[model samples]
Target: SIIDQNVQALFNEISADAVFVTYDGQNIKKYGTHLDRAKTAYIPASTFKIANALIGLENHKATSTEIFKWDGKPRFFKAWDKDFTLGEAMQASTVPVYQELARRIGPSLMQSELQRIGYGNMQIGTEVDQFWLKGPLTITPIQEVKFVYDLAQGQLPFKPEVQQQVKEMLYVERRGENRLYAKSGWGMAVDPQVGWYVGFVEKADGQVVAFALNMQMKAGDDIALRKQLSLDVLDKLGVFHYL
Candidate 1:
């Protein structure tokens, strides 16, 4: 398997059982403990927020400035207590803020936007704010990769500026000369809680490496493994370069 070579080896190094899919503009490949898991649907959780943010921007429901005001309502995480801008809400993955944004975007618009992008199974369920959390919404690793690939290529229904803005919001950090932009998700309420890190790499050459990876995690496991291992896998695939 062209996908197996270094991917499996790096996965072994991290000792995590996961599904990985990547398209580096040339070779698009996948491998994992079970490739079938790549196609298996899992609750998207916050990963779907990427789409939420895009839809919100596209519909002009919100903008980069003055995203929303926090209602002074308390949340499980105190960090979400204050008002938030689009960048703040997205960077922190604030649930309530985005839930409100979804409420504003409404079901009709959400349905249309999601359908246009062909999001996983294209099911929004009945709850506008809760569907992607732990409801009926789910996406496979395979579909996730394609979604991000399309997003990076400006293939999503949104305008190029919308994609660029959302991509800016997704930026994680500069890895040497490469930049990694992605969303991390955890399906906490679902059984065998799944963890995800999906996004693309803007290579030094301006090429793109779009990827989606998810794995099951034990309740007490080191949470950092979710991203740590995924990046290592990217390293295995020759996605990084040192200055």
Candidate 2:
């Protein structure tokens, strides 16, 4: 099957010791033999933006168009431009903008939200301001798959409306089928660039498929490599054919 072959290719390409891909709400289809590390963690990087977005929407801290001021002050990078909304901030993957959003929401609210969302073994940490850089919050592939599935079903701890809002925000446009909602994250601290892409697909047959893809690579390298890898994998998995 294309899925099996493509999975093998990914394992070979990255020399990944372990790789897991679950589709259509099934058990992980593993590639490359490696023992489950039982406890594995990685800094989520921009992926944490998803959590930040949900918190902002729930708390009414900002709207999709609510501008976030850059203020011409240098922090993390030379501050330029006027301002950006929560949505633009996310799309731009601006660190300072998201960090500010996190601060407004606060650790207490963020913690409660994370807990409410059923994220176990994940803590918001005491330095609420630095939530963006907090690295290696532990999570397993199996758990990630489950969390995404639940999120797709709107079964997590947020209100139904909030879940719908998330779905709309993360939704990606595709050709011929319903749509796919996804968010991608990359962390440069670990292996250079640790990548994460997660989202769900709504099929014409009324089936909803959700997936998360995480990869690690050296920094300053082409971050788009992993994204292309993900698209290639999905294409080989027949995701587009279904659409």
Candidate 3:
């Protein structure tokens, strides 16, 4: 069946070790052989932006509307070298802006809030700004699915408004009555470079299908496959059929 073969085929075509997992209301589905890897944690990279935004907002360190000015330094991606609001920064996956937000949140609050939210290992390390991107802080694909699922359902421990505000920052695209919201992450500090695409799609009937994909990435172009493979698996599972 395509459901069983999709992740394997996709990873075979790209030649990488990968895992794709989804939760459709009641049942949990997993594809590919690295099922245990789905439960193992890895650095979140920019995907941490979602949680960072929520913590920053809840702690009064940042607002959705305030401008995050660029330091005028050159960045790897030109899109990130300018000012951005929390939403814009999420969309751009701008590192510096969220790093600044983390700095403002500080180690003490970041640790307590992560513990409160049950995010990954909840370890922020000595360098608060670099933990999620560099090392020590990690989350699994299963955890990613759970986190976004709660965020979508407004079931996180944070205030309703805070969850809702952070949820809006994840908007990716809408296809008719079905809308997709996701974020991608690249674990630059890990061996066999981890790539991630984690989010949920809300169908017209109000049913939500949440998914997470993480793969061993090689060259730079493999970054695009994180979301592509997840969508491919989701489509195979009839996630987009509602529209």
Which candidate leads the pack in lDDT? 3
What would the C-alpha RMSD of candidate 2 be, to one decimal place?
3.1
TM-score of each: 0.90, 0.82, 0.93
| lDDT of each candidate versus the true structure | 0.82, 0.65, 0.85
Question: Which 10 consecutive positions of candidate 3 have the poorest summed lDDT?
Answer: 2-11
Q: For residues 1-243, what per-residue lDDT tens digits would candidate 3 score against the true structure?
A: 756665467666766777888887577778865778788889888889989999999989988899998878888898788889999889888888898999999999999999998899999889999998887899998889989988898888888999999998999888888889999998877776788999999877878888888777765665566777777777767775434
TM-score for predicted model 3 compared with the true structure: 0.93
lDDT of 1 by residue, 160-182 (tens): 99988887888888876789888
The worst-scoring run of ten residues by lDDT in candidate 1 lies at 234-243
RMSD vs true structure, all candidates: 2.3, 3.1, 1.8
Better of 1 and 3 by lDDT: 3
- Candidate 1 stretches with Cα past 4 Å from truth are 1-6, 13-16, 241-243
Predictions ranked by lDDT, top down?
Answer: 3, 1, 2
